[PDB]
Symmetry: D2
Subunit: 184 residues, 4 copies
């Protein structure tokens, strides 16, 4: 018997990174309205997901609009959600002789001090890819894997010849945006 007069969404704006999420609050007026149910909706669902409780999750770079609409009265308020780039910062996961630099959503694989170096890698349940790593020109090597998303699972190991003869590396698993690096 106490009708909804209005709604507002707080925060009214928010920046998340990909895989990051932010809880939104629908504020229904008056305080003692009989029906305080709202429907959450988003106009760019490839940018950000919203749950039935207004938890918003960053899916991909962009700005979108999340709307709370009241069950009683169909009053609507909206917030602007900016999903930001993965920082351009370099994070080393590996050692002097071989591993990864995570550089945003590309992975730069490296082998220092070899006569050659191949990378063997797979992403999620896609197949093995074998690549010869590019020579820097000083006995060092690199190969970029491009455009991973949050939760991409990377299994890789190297083949290379540091002197004595060609050596295989132990496989490693990298999950994009969960494997901790060293922020160098």
């Amino acid at each position: 018997n106490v009708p909804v007069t209005g709604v507002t969404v707080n925060p009214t704006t928010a920046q998340v990174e990909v895989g990051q999420s932010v809880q939104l609050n629908a504020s229904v007026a008056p305080s003692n309205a009989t029906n305080k149910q709202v429907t959450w909706s988003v106009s760019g669902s490839s940018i950000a997901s919203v749950s039935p409780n207004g938890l918003v999750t960053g899916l991909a770079q962009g700005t979108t609009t999340v709307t709370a609409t009241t069950a009683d009265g169909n009053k609507a308020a909206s917030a602007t959600i900016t999903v930001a780039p993965a920082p351009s910062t370099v994070i080393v996961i590996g050692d002097e002789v071989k591993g990864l630099k995570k550089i945003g959503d590309d992975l730069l694989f490296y082998v220092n001090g070899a006569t050659f170096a191949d990378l063997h890698y797979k992403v999620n349940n896609g197949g093995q890819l074998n690549v010869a790593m590019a020579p820097t020109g000083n006995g060092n090597y690199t190969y970029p894997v491009h455009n991973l998303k949050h939760g991409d699972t990377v299994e890789y190991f190297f083949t290379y010849n540091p002197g004595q003869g060609a050596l295989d590396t132990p496989w490693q698993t990298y999950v994009h945006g969960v494997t901790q690096g060293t922020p160098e």
Copy 2:
């Protein structure tokens, strides 16, 4: 003592789908050249990967150039590789009451005959996303998940109320471009 005179790559062009691969042949002249080693390289490695044996794998929509260069003489030939879109065709994986349509690289989740329907899903090792599915307006529901790639692993189940009361579905696993559907 028999020097390389030239090289050609066959096929000279090729279309693959994403996750599809094509073996390329470097033809070194003359036939009895002492050194027949070549280096394979690709100018758009976000489009297609090439192995040290000239196996080319479709990574993402585009056209790129794969080059064989001879170890002896640095003679170069190149092929054009077109990585094609995942067909726009609709493939149903699920039943009368609930599952997926695979429509290119988007997944259309569905629940037929409910008073409401939520989807619970996760991709690779990213987190759970909870979404209320959109009403069609006849007791039916849909929710598109966007832009999966080859080997994306999707675990999902539904919550919905077909009458008696709200019911949870058994979890299912979908691997993008490996789970077989029904081409409808």
Copy 3:
């Protein structure tokens, strides 16, 4: 007086990027006082919907355009699939020079030369200078990647077909507008 329900017409439709489909909302009784609806879209990157329910395809994917009633806020949906540009081949030039349009990439080409460069600009971006890749039979190619509908490519070649080097005249390609022959 009240409205009771609504569904949308069509319920599912497939478009190419850059193409449109007119949506129409049918609201239960004709003797419903208020007919007017609001159009919205779940996935605005994929498809845009006008205030009168015209859906245009912007990018590959499937999205949900919903009509909600002014009187009632009853809601119904169409599933819109935006299909990618065919990887058919479209030749725009002559035996010596031009593009192949292969979906959203352009394969620029020069046939019969000792080198070939490309000079191109996309819309109001900067000019880029590139050496075209040798094929190994006196011909050259260079892919420009991932053009979107309405992209405007200005370009000319520098090549030497033997009796000395040449700059061709600038041509204008508009992506999804300019046409050629496929074969």
Copy 4:
């Protein structure tokens, strides 16, 4: 007479999309007869390299630009990182109407109106008509998604600030060129 080796200068460099960095190849002995190199790139979608080693950033990612010697075909590499456009906010308009540039999306806005539509065209694409989304305090927003450097946006609004409806004049935004104030 021969060349013995080469490395590239710089070895690693980071650019924004649309920005450039001059690469230089240093080939072992100065008393190497032939100095000339060929520039190539592993990832042409990410970065373009000119015949004289100028690398321009086209799109987010890391790629390898290699200099190989004409005499010797010795090869060396730089790792190029192309950084995304900051998600800083850039206001281009007044208290009533304009855009926020937020990385590669534009948030169009009208403040203080009873409705607001956007009319926009991108480069030589078609005009799109959209109803701007109510905020719930008499203001309106509408994101345009994923513009690339050099994209040319023509737009005007239809809104009613109370004493009746208005079409504003068309403005031209060029992505990464047009500027405003961030704050």
